[PDB]
Amino acid sequence: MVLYFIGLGLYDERDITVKGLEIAKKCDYVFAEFYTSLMAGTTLGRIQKLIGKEIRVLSREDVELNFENIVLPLAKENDVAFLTPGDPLVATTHAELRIRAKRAGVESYVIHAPSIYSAVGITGLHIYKFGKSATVAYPEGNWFPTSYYDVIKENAERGLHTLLFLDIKAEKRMYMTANEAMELMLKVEDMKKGGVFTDDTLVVVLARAGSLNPTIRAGYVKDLIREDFGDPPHILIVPGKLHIVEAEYLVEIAGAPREILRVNV
Amino acid sequence: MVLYFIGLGLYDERDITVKGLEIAKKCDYVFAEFYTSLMAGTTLGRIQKLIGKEIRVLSREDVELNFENIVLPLAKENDVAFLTPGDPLVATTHAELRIRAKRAGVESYVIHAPSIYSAVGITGLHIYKFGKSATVAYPEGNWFPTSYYDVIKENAERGLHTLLFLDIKAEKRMYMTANEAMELMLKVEDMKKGGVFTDDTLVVVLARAGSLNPTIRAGYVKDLIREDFGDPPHILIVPGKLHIVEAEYLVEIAGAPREILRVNV
Ligand SMILES: Nc1ncnc2c1ncn2[C@@H]1O[C@H](CSCC[C@H](N)C(=O)O)[C@@H](O)[C@H]1O
Ligand code: NA
């Protein structure tokens, strides 16, 4: 009578950990959600085939409003697994679901999986140098989100890198590209005029981490804003002051302009 | 002609991903390092048995000084794997190993795995709220480093959480315990008297992340400094002001005192 939160990883069904797979194969019921992120390299069918179980996919409403009515009941008498893209607790509100499990007298366990939060290391940017993170959300009607602007500002001032999660509207199959993120951000800069994010700002784009050939690009906004980085998901990063070896990596591996090698210490 | 950087994950031999295992099994040569960290929940023998390949262990010097003459030559005519605890490229000097590969006309691919950077999400603390990260090191001779103290200060000051890695002596398999870290920091607070780390400071301890039964504890230093957190590795976190949901998780899941619901929110 336990509930397992099992992450599926970054790109395809093989990004699940061996631990996660062996446990998932032995659960009586398997649920999952695919709205918190996009696993561009697999399909529900492939996942099901891999674990050898039928997977009942849940919507944001099913989870957020009815988790304790749909999932928890079965966990009281069976072994249940709840699958999610990446790591189940990273940049989601899934952690709170563990509190619901407890209140319903259901023991829960967490099986991690590779997350975009650590995969940023493939950009060559020292991970310990990342500051507060943020999300670039799509404007809705008259509401235009801007919180991410001050986060970048705050981190840049301290010389820290900023990781920017990009928006996703799964039910509409909408996945924000780095290009769309940059356009929205330039519009905010136009309004705030803080010099935080401009055409001369160096940025890094990581697309489809987890795949064997992810797209890793670094350069100035003016040059990258219209570049094609391939299919989603995309993640955007605004570096802070660079170490010599970070700049070297960005140039040698991410195709950045050789001029970023010259750091302004 | 190919070099694979493969992450081993968090704690035991099952923490590698299905993708990492299958690729490792097809490699002609397999190297690994355990100087950046150890896999406390398993052994070299178990990892070797699971992968079914002899694993050549490399020291810090083998990697930093001679990676290109030990690993890369073999990668020119074979498929070589380089295993590391956690997620590849998280250790700050590992990213530059890919530059070395390029220079040697060797292709390299990264296979991700769970990292403590993302696994800490199991503490219920929102990942976007983490700021700069640091490592707590032991004073030595006339050297008394305290940089991590300023990091905690700069983060908390902005409402951000601080992830603290504890000093480790891989070769000797000597880990700094959370208890030792706290004592060291109270000592640092006594010298800088900045009111950053005191008996009243709230902290979180994560031990054996990755195992099915990790130790997750939260509370004030005065009560946790002498508490037994079990076998290493221990990870320490000094949270910034908490979101009521984070605090509730720490109370319900990590045994934190009710008091945090009004004092640290
Ligand atoms: N493989 C990938 N490549 C690039 N960005 C990714 C990604 N996976 C997730 N993201 C980014 O993160 C957003 C989802 S946020 C949820 C993250 C997830 N729990 C994890 O552990 O990774 C996406 O909209 C995208 O901006
Ligand atoms: Na971080």
Short mmCIF file of N, CA and C in Angstrom, two decimals, chain A residues 4 10-23 50 87 89-92 95-96 98-99 102-103 108-115 117-134 154-155 157-158 160 165 209-213 216 245 248-249 251-253, chain B residues 4 10-23 26 50 87-90 92-93 95-96 98-99 102-103 109-115 117-134 151 154-155 158 160 209-213 216 245 248-249 251-253:
data_model
loop_
_atom_site.label_atom_id
_atom_site.label_comp_id
_atom_site.label_asym_id
_atom_site.label_seq_id
_atom_site.Cartn_x
_atom_site.Cartn_y
_atom_site.Cartn_z
N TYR A 4 4.46 5.59 -5.37
CA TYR A 4 5.78 5.93 -5.87
C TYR A 4 5.72 7.09 -6.85
N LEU A 10 14.62 13.35 -19.05
CA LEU A 10 14.62 14.45 -20.00
C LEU A 10 14.05 14.31 -21.41
N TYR A 11 14.29 13.19 -22.07
CA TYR A 11 13.88 13.09 -23.46
C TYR A 11 13.05 11.89 -23.91
N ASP A 12 13.53 10.68 -23.63
CA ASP A 12 12.81 9.49 -24.05
C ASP A 12 12.63 8.51 -22.89
N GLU A 13 11.93 7.41 -23.15
CA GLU A 13 11.67 6.42 -22.11
C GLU A 13 12.91 5.80 -21.47
N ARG A 14 14.05 5.88 -22.14
CA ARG A 14 15.26 5.31 -21.57
C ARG A 14 15.94 6.22 -20.54
N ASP A 15 15.39 7.41 -20.33
CA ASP A 15 15.97 8.33 -19.35
C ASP A 15 15.51 8.04 -17.92
N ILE A 16 14.68 7.01 -17.77
CA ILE A 16 14.22 6.61 -16.44
C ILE A 16 15.40 5.85 -15.83
N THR A 17 15.53 5.87 -14.51
CA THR A 17 16.63 5.15 -13.87
C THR A 17 16.27 3.67 -13.78
N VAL A 18 17.28 2.82 -13.65
CA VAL A 18 17.05 1.39 -13.54
C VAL A 18 16.17 1.13 -12.34
N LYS A 19 16.42 1.85 -11.25
CA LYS A 19 15.63 1.72 -10.04
C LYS A 19 14.16 2.01 -10.36
N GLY A 20 13.93 3.14 -11.03
CA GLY A 20 12.58 3.52 -11.39
C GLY A 20 11.88 2.48 -12.25
N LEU A 21 12.59 1.92 -13.22
CA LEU A 21 12.00 0.93 -14.11
C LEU A 21 11.60 -0.36 -13.39
N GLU A 22 12.52 -0.92 -12.62
CA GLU A 22 12.25 -2.17 -11.90
C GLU A 22 11.07 -2.04 -10.94
N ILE A 23 10.94 -0.89 -10.31
CA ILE A 23 9.85 -0.66 -9.37
C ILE A 23 8.55 -0.43 -10.13
N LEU A 50 7.77 -0.27 -22.42
CA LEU A 50 8.95 -0.42 -21.58
C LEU A 50 8.64 -0.94 -20.18
N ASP A 87 12.45 15.14 -13.31
CA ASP A 87 12.39 14.76 -11.90
C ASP A 87 11.01 15.23 -11.44
N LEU A 89 9.72 16.27 -8.69
CA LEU A 89 9.58 17.40 -7.77
C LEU A 89 10.26 18.71 -8.18
N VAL A 90 10.90 18.71 -9.35
CA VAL A 90 11.62 19.89 -9.83
C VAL A 90 10.80 20.84 -10.70
N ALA A 91 10.50 22.02 -10.16
CA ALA A 91 9.74 23.03 -10.89
C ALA A 91 8.31 22.58 -11.18
N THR A 92 7.72 21.91 -10.19
CA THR A 92 6.34 21.45 -10.27
C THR A 92 5.84 21.69 -8.86
N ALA A 95 5.41 18.18 -4.95
CA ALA A 95 5.85 17.90 -3.59
C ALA A 95 4.68 17.92 -2.60
N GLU A 96 3.75 18.84 -2.83
CA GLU A 96 2.57 18.99 -1.98
C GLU A 96 1.70 17.74 -2.03
N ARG A 98 2.70 14.87 -1.74
CA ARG A 98 3.21 13.94 -0.73
C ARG A 98 2.50 14.21 0.59
N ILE A 99 2.13 15.47 0.82
CA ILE A 99 1.42 15.82 2.05
C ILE A 99 0.02 15.22 2.00
N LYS A 102 0.23 11.56 2.82
CA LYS A 102 0.35 11.35 4.25
C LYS A 102 -1.01 11.48 4.94
N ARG A 103 -1.72 12.57 4.66
CA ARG A 103 -3.01 12.81 5.28
C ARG A 103 -4.04 11.72 4.98
N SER A 108 4.62 7.27 0.76
CA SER A 108 5.09 7.57 -0.59
C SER A 108 6.62 7.57 -0.67
N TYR A 109 7.14 7.24 -1.84
CA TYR A 109 8.57 7.21 -2.07
C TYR A 109 8.88 7.93 -3.36
N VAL A 110 10.06 8.52 -3.43
CA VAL A 110 10.47 9.28 -4.60
C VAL A 110 11.68 8.68 -5.32
N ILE A 111 11.50 8.40 -6.60
CA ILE A 111 12.59 7.88 -7.43
C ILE A 111 12.92 9.00 -8.40
N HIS A 112 14.09 9.59 -8.23
CA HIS A 112 14.53 10.68 -9.08
C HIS A 112 14.88 10.24 -10.48
N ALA A 113 15.07 11.23 -11.35
CA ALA A 113 15.44 11.00 -12.75
C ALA A 113 16.18 12.26 -13.20
N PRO A 114 16.94 12.17 -14.31
CA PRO A 114 17.66 13.36 -14.76
C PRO A 114 16.71 14.53 -15.00
N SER A 115 17.11 15.70 -14.51
CA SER A 115 16.33 16.92 -14.60
C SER A 115 17.04 18.01 -15.39
N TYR A 117 17.22 20.92 -14.58
CA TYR A 117 17.91 21.77 -13.62
C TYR A 117 19.39 21.42 -13.48
N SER A 118 19.75 20.15 -13.63
CA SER A 118 21.15 19.77 -13.53
C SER A 118 21.76 19.60 -14.92
N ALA A 119 20.91 19.29 -15.90
CA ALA A 119 21.38 19.10 -17.26
C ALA A 119 22.00 20.37 -17.84
N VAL A 120 21.76 21.51 -17.20
CA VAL A 120 22.32 22.78 -17.67
C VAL A 120 23.85 22.70 -17.67
N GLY A 121 24.38 21.75 -16.92
CA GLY A 121 25.82 21.57 -16.85
C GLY A 121 26.44 21.30 -18.21
N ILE A 122 25.64 20.82 -19.15
CA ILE A 122 26.16 20.54 -20.48
C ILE A 122 26.44 21.83 -21.28
N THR A 123 26.01 22.97 -20.74
CA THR A 123 26.25 24.26 -21.41
C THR A 123 27.66 24.78 -21.09
N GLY A 124 28.34 24.13 -20.15
CA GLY A 124 29.68 24.55 -19.78
C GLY A 124 29.70 25.61 -18.68
N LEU A 125 28.52 26.07 -18.28
CA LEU A 125 28.39 27.07 -17.23
C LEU A 125 28.46 26.36 -15.87
N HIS A 126 29.33 26.83 -14.98
CA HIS A 126 29.45 26.22 -13.66
C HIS A 126 28.10 26.26 -12.97
N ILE A 127 27.58 25.08 -12.65
CA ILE A 127 26.27 24.97 -12.02
C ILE A 127 26.16 25.63 -10.66
N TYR A 128 27.25 25.69 -9.89
CA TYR A 128 27.16 26.33 -8.58
C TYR A 128 27.00 27.85 -8.72
N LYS A 129 27.22 28.38 -9.92
CA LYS A 129 27.11 29.81 -10.17
C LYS A 129 25.72 30.28 -10.60
N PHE A 130 24.77 29.36 -10.70
CA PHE A 130 23.41 29.75 -11.07
C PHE A 130 22.74 30.38 -9.85
N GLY A 131 21.99 31.45 -10.08
CA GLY A 131 21.30 32.11 -8.98
C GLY A 131 19.84 31.69 -8.98
N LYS A 132 18.98 32.57 -8.50
CA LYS A 132 17.55 32.30 -8.47
C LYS A 132 17.11 31.99 -9.90
N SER A 133 16.13 31.10 -10.03
CA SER A 133 15.62 30.72 -11.35
C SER A 133 14.26 31.36 -11.59
N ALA A 134 13.82 31.37 -12.85
CA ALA A 134 12.53 31.96 -13.18
C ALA A 134 11.88 31.29 -14.38
N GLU A 154 18.70 40.86 -10.66
CA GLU A 154 19.28 40.53 -9.36
C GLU A 154 20.48 39.59 -9.45
N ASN A 155 20.37 38.54 -10.27
CA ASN A 155 21.47 37.59 -10.43
C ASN A 155 22.67 38.20 -11.14
N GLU A 157 23.63 41.22 -11.21
CA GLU A 157 24.30 42.14 -10.29
C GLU A 157 25.30 41.41 -9.39
N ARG A 158 24.96 40.18 -9.02
CA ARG A 158 25.80 39.35 -8.16
C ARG A 158 26.73 38.48 -9.00
N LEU A 160 25.76 36.11 -11.10
CA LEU A 160 25.23 34.75 -11.19
C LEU A 160 24.42 34.50 -12.47
N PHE A 165 13.04 28.76 -17.19
CA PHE A 165 12.16 27.69 -17.64
C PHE A 165 11.21 28.37 -18.63
N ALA A 209 17.49 18.59 -24.21
CA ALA A 209 18.52 17.98 -23.38
C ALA A 209 18.09 16.53 -23.19
N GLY A 210 19.05 15.63 -23.02
CA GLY A 210 18.69 14.24 -22.84
C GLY A 210 18.80 13.46 -24.13
N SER A 211 18.57 14.12 -25.26
CA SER A 211 18.71 13.45 -26.54
C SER A 211 20.21 13.36 -26.77
N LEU A 212 20.63 12.54 -27.72
CA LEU A 212 22.05 12.39 -28.00
C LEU A 212 22.61 13.64 -28.67
N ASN A 213 21.77 14.33 -29.44
CA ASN A 213 22.24 15.54 -30.11
C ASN A 213 21.41 16.75 -29.75
N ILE A 216 22.85 23.13 -28.50
CA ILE A 216 23.48 23.99 -27.50
C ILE A 216 24.06 25.21 -28.22
N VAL A 245 37.19 29.44 -18.48
CA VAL A 245 36.83 28.14 -19.03
C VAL A 245 35.37 28.02 -19.47
N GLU A 248 35.39 29.65 -22.82
CA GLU A 248 36.07 28.76 -23.76
C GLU A 248 35.12 27.66 -24.21
N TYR A 249 34.37 27.09 -23.28
CA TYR A 249 33.44 26.01 -23.61
C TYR A 249 32.34 26.52 -24.53
N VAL A 251 32.38 28.87 -26.62
CA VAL A 251 32.93 29.11 -27.96
C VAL A 251 33.25 27.81 -28.69
N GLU A 252 33.98 26.92 -28.02
CA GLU A 252 34.36 25.65 -28.63
C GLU A 252 33.22 24.67 -28.81
N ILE A 253 32.27 24.67 -27.88
CA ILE A 253 31.16 23.72 -27.93
C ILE A 253 29.81 24.30 -28.34
N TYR B 4 31.58 8.52 -24.38
CA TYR B 4 30.32 8.78 -23.69
C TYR B 4 30.53 9.20 -22.23
N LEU B 10 22.56 9.12 -8.08
CA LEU B 10 22.71 9.47 -6.68
C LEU B 10 23.29 8.57 -5.59
N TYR B 11 22.88 7.31 -5.53
CA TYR B 11 23.29 6.49 -4.40
C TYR B 11 23.77 5.06 -4.63
N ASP B 12 23.06 4.29 -5.44
CA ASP B 12 23.47 2.92 -5.68
C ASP B 12 23.58 2.60 -7.16
N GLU B 13 23.92 1.35 -7.47
CA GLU B 13 24.10 0.95 -8.86
C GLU B 13 22.84 1.01 -9.73
N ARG B 14 21.67 1.13 -9.11
CA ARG B 14 20.45 1.21 -9.90
C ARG B 14 20.09 2.66 -10.25
N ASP B 15 20.94 3.59 -9.82
CA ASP B 15 20.68 5.00 -10.07
C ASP B 15 21.14 5.50 -11.44
N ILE B 16 21.74 4.61 -12.21
CA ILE B 16 22.17 4.94 -13.57
C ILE B 16 20.87 4.81 -14.38
N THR B 17 20.76 5.49 -15.51
CA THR B 17 19.54 5.38 -16.31
C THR B 17 19.60 4.19 -17.26
N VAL B 18 18.43 3.75 -17.73
CA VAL B 18 18.37 2.64 -18.66
C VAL B 18 19.26 2.94 -19.87
N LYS B 19 19.23 4.18 -20.32
CA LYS B 19 20.04 4.62 -21.45
C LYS B 19 21.54 4.52 -21.14
N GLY B 20 21.92 4.96 -19.94
CA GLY B 20 23.32 4.92 -19.56
C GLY B 20 23.87 3.51 -19.44
N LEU B 21 23.03 2.59 -18.96
CA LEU B 21 23.44 1.20 -18.80
C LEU B 21 23.63 0.52 -20.15
N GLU B 22 22.64 0.64 -21.02
CA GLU B 22 22.72 0.01 -22.33
C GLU B 22 23.90 0.53 -23.15
N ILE B 23 24.16 1.83 -23.09
CA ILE B 23 25.27 2.40 -23.84
C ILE B 23 26.59 1.92 -23.24
N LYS B 26 27.66 -1.50 -24.33
CA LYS B 26 28.15 -1.60 -25.70
C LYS B 26 29.52 -0.96 -25.92
N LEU B 50 26.73 -5.17 -12.64
CA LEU B 50 25.54 -4.68 -13.32
C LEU B 50 25.82 -4.29 -14.77
N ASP B 87 25.26 13.46 -12.13
CA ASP B 87 25.01 13.85 -13.52
C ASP B 87 26.33 14.34 -14.13
N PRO B 88 26.66 13.86 -15.35
CA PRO B 88 27.92 14.29 -15.97
C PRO B 88 27.99 15.82 -16.11
N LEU B 89 29.21 16.34 -16.04
CA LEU B 89 29.46 17.77 -16.19
C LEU B 89 29.00 18.70 -15.07
N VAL B 90 28.55 18.14 -13.96
CA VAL B 90 28.16 18.97 -12.83
C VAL B 90 29.44 19.41 -12.10
N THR B 92 32.57 21.07 -11.52
CA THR B 92 33.03 22.22 -12.30
C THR B 92 34.14 22.06 -13.34
N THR B 93 35.06 21.12 -13.16
CA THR B 93 36.12 20.96 -14.15
C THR B 93 35.82 19.94 -15.26
N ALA B 95 33.30 19.83 -17.53
CA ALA B 95 32.87 20.38 -18.82
C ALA B 95 34.07 20.55 -19.77
N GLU B 96 35.21 21.03 -19.26
CA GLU B 96 36.36 21.25 -20.13
C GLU B 96 36.95 19.97 -20.72
N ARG B 98 35.31 17.96 -22.42
CA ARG B 98 34.71 17.83 -23.75
C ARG B 98 35.51 18.65 -24.75
N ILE B 99 36.13 19.72 -24.27
CA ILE B 99 36.94 20.55 -25.15
C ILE B 99 38.14 19.70 -25.52
N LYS B 102 37.21 17.28 -28.26
CA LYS B 102 37.13 17.95 -29.56
C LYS B 102 38.52 18.11 -30.17
N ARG B 103 39.44 18.66 -29.38
CA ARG B 103 40.81 18.87 -29.82
C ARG B 103 41.46 17.57 -30.32
N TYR B 109 29.41 12.41 -26.22
CA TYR B 109 27.99 12.55 -25.94
C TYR B 109 27.78 12.44 -24.45
N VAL B 110 26.76 13.14 -23.96
CA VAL B 110 26.46 13.14 -22.54
C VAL B 110 25.17 12.39 -22.23
N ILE B 111 25.27 11.46 -21.28
CA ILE B 111 24.12 10.68 -20.84
C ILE B 111 23.88 11.15 -19.41
N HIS B 112 22.76 11.82 -19.21
CA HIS B 112 22.41 12.37 -17.92
C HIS B 112 21.92 11.36 -16.88
N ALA B 113 21.96 11.78 -15.62
CA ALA B 113 21.51 10.95 -14.52
C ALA B 113 21.14 11.91 -13.39
N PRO B 114 20.42 11.43 -12.37
CA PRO B 114 20.03 12.30 -11.26
C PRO B 114 21.21 12.96 -10.55
N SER B 115 21.03 14.22 -10.19
CA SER B 115 22.03 15.00 -9.49
C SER B 115 21.42 15.51 -8.18
N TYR B 117 21.67 18.38 -7.12
CA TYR B 117 21.15 19.71 -7.42
C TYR B 117 19.64 19.67 -7.64
N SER B 118 19.16 18.60 -8.29
CA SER B 118 17.73 18.46 -8.53
C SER B 118 17.08 17.56 -7.48
N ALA B 119 17.80 16.54 -7.02
CA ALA B 119 17.27 15.62 -6.01
C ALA B 119 16.90 16.35 -4.72
N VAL B 120 17.55 17.47 -4.42
CA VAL B 120 17.21 18.22 -3.20
C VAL B 120 15.75 18.67 -3.23
N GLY B 121 15.11 18.53 -4.39
CA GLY B 121 13.71 18.90 -4.48
C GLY B 121 12.87 18.07 -3.52
N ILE B 122 13.42 16.95 -3.06
CA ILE B 122 12.69 16.08 -2.14
C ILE B 122 12.52 16.70 -0.76
N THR B 123 13.21 17.80 -0.50
CA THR B 123 13.09 18.50 0.78
C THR B 123 11.82 19.37 0.79
N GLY B 124 11.15 19.48 -0.35
CA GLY B 124 9.95 20.30 -0.42
C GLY B 124 10.25 21.77 -0.69
N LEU B 125 11.52 22.13 -0.77
CA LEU B 125 11.90 23.52 -1.05
C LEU B 125 11.82 23.75 -2.55
N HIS B 126 11.20 24.85 -2.97
CA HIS B 126 11.06 25.14 -4.40
C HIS B 126 12.43 25.36 -5.02
N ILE B 127 12.70 24.63 -6.10
CA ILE B 127 13.98 24.72 -6.78
C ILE B 127 14.32 26.12 -7.31
N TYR B 128 13.34 26.84 -7.83
CA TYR B 128 13.64 28.17 -8.36
C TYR B 128 14.15 29.10 -7.27
N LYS B 129 13.88 28.77 -6.01
CA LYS B 129 14.32 29.62 -4.91
C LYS B 129 15.75 29.40 -4.43
N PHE B 130 16.47 28.45 -5.03
CA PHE B 130 17.85 28.25 -4.62
C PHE B 130 18.70 29.33 -5.28
N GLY B 131 19.69 29.82 -4.54
CA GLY B 131 20.58 30.83 -5.07
C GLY B 131 21.93 30.19 -5.34
N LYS B 132 23.00 30.96 -5.18
CA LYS B 132 24.33 30.45 -5.41
C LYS B 132 24.62 29.27 -4.47
N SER B 133 25.39 28.31 -4.97
CA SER B 133 25.73 27.14 -4.18
C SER B 133 27.16 27.20 -3.67
N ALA B 134 27.42 26.50 -2.57
CA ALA B 134 28.76 26.51 -2.00
C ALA B 134 29.14 25.19 -1.32
N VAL B 151 28.08 33.43 1.08
CA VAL B 151 27.12 32.95 0.10
C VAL B 151 25.77 32.83 0.79
N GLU B 154 24.36 36.28 1.32
CA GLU B 154 23.84 36.95 0.13
C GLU B 154 22.54 36.31 -0.34
N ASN B 155 22.43 34.99 -0.24
CA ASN B 155 21.21 34.30 -0.66
C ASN B 155 20.02 34.59 0.25
N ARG B 158 18.19 37.71 0.07
CA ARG B 158 17.27 37.88 -1.05
C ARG B 158 16.15 36.84 -1.04
N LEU B 160 16.49 33.60 -0.76
CA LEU B 160 16.88 32.40 -1.49
C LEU B 160 17.50 31.33 -0.59
N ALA B 209 20.28 10.74 -0.36
CA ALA B 209 19.31 11.07 -1.39
C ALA B 209 19.49 9.99 -2.44
N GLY B 210 18.40 9.51 -3.03
CA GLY B 210 18.52 8.47 -4.04
C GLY B 210 18.11 7.12 -3.50
N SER B 211 18.40 6.86 -2.23
CA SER B 211 18.00 5.59 -1.64
C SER B 211 16.48 5.69 -1.45
N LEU B 212 15.83 4.55 -1.24
CA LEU B 212 14.39 4.54 -1.04
C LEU B 212 14.04 5.06 0.35
N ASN B 213 15.02 5.06 1.25
CA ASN B 213 14.77 5.53 2.61
C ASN B 213 15.75 6.61 3.05
N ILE B 216 15.47 12.89 5.81
CA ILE B 216 15.13 14.28 5.52
C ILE B 216 14.70 14.91 6.84
N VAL B 245 3.73 26.68 1.85
CA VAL B 245 3.66 25.31 1.35
C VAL B 245 4.97 24.57 1.63
N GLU B 248 5.00 23.75 5.33
CA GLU B 248 4.09 22.66 5.66
C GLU B 248 4.71 21.32 5.30
N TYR B 249 5.44 21.27 4.19
CA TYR B 249 6.08 20.03 3.75
C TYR B 249 7.18 19.66 4.75
N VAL B 251 7.26 20.31 7.83
CA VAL B 251 6.62 19.86 9.07
C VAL B 251 6.06 18.44 8.93
N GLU B 252 5.29 18.23 7.87
CA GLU B 252 4.66 16.94 7.63
C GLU B 252 5.58 15.82 7.16
N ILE B 253 6.59 16.17 6.37
CA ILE B 253 7.50 15.17 5.82
C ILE B 253 8.87 15.06 6.49
#
